[PDB]
Ligand binder design. Sequence first.
Ligand SMILES: CCCc1ccccc1
Ligand SMILES: [Cl-]
Length: 162
Amino acid sequence: MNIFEMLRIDEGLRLKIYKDTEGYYTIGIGHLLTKSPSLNAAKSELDKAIGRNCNGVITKDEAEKLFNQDVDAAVRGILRNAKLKPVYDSLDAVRRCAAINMVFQMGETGVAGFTNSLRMLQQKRWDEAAVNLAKSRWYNQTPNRAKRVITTFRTGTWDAYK
Ligand SMILES: CCCc1ccccc1
Ligand SMILES: [Cl-]
């Protein structure tokens, strides 16, 4: 497994504009278009992102290109953030994927506020980190996905995704 296979499981693939778990217009593999309630605003953001008039529909190739850009952006957000980078650099390769997954879902700023969990992860206190990560709006709103990510941090294996 790798980060692309992991996020494809967590996000799915839809080729027409849809609403995410929070009600926001989204397309592809979890690509957020806008938080505005206007479908026309979402369609405008989509055309700008793809470079053509899409009328709310994209191809699989276009979805996978947005996905590559979004994963790259998540990694760069980690590497430029003074709170996230040292923790990320301390992790093994499997747990790094769990970190990228959280930033992809919630953004660099949201994850950087998980101050106590970040310290526990840097100290390699896996069970303690797992308990702390579950005490969150994130876990309560998307519990099945959060459980998979937390299990990945707890064990350093892909068992939750197999
Ligand atoms: C609970 C924080 C997960 C994380 C995210 C980015 C980099 C390191 C750790
Ligand atoms: Cl879920």
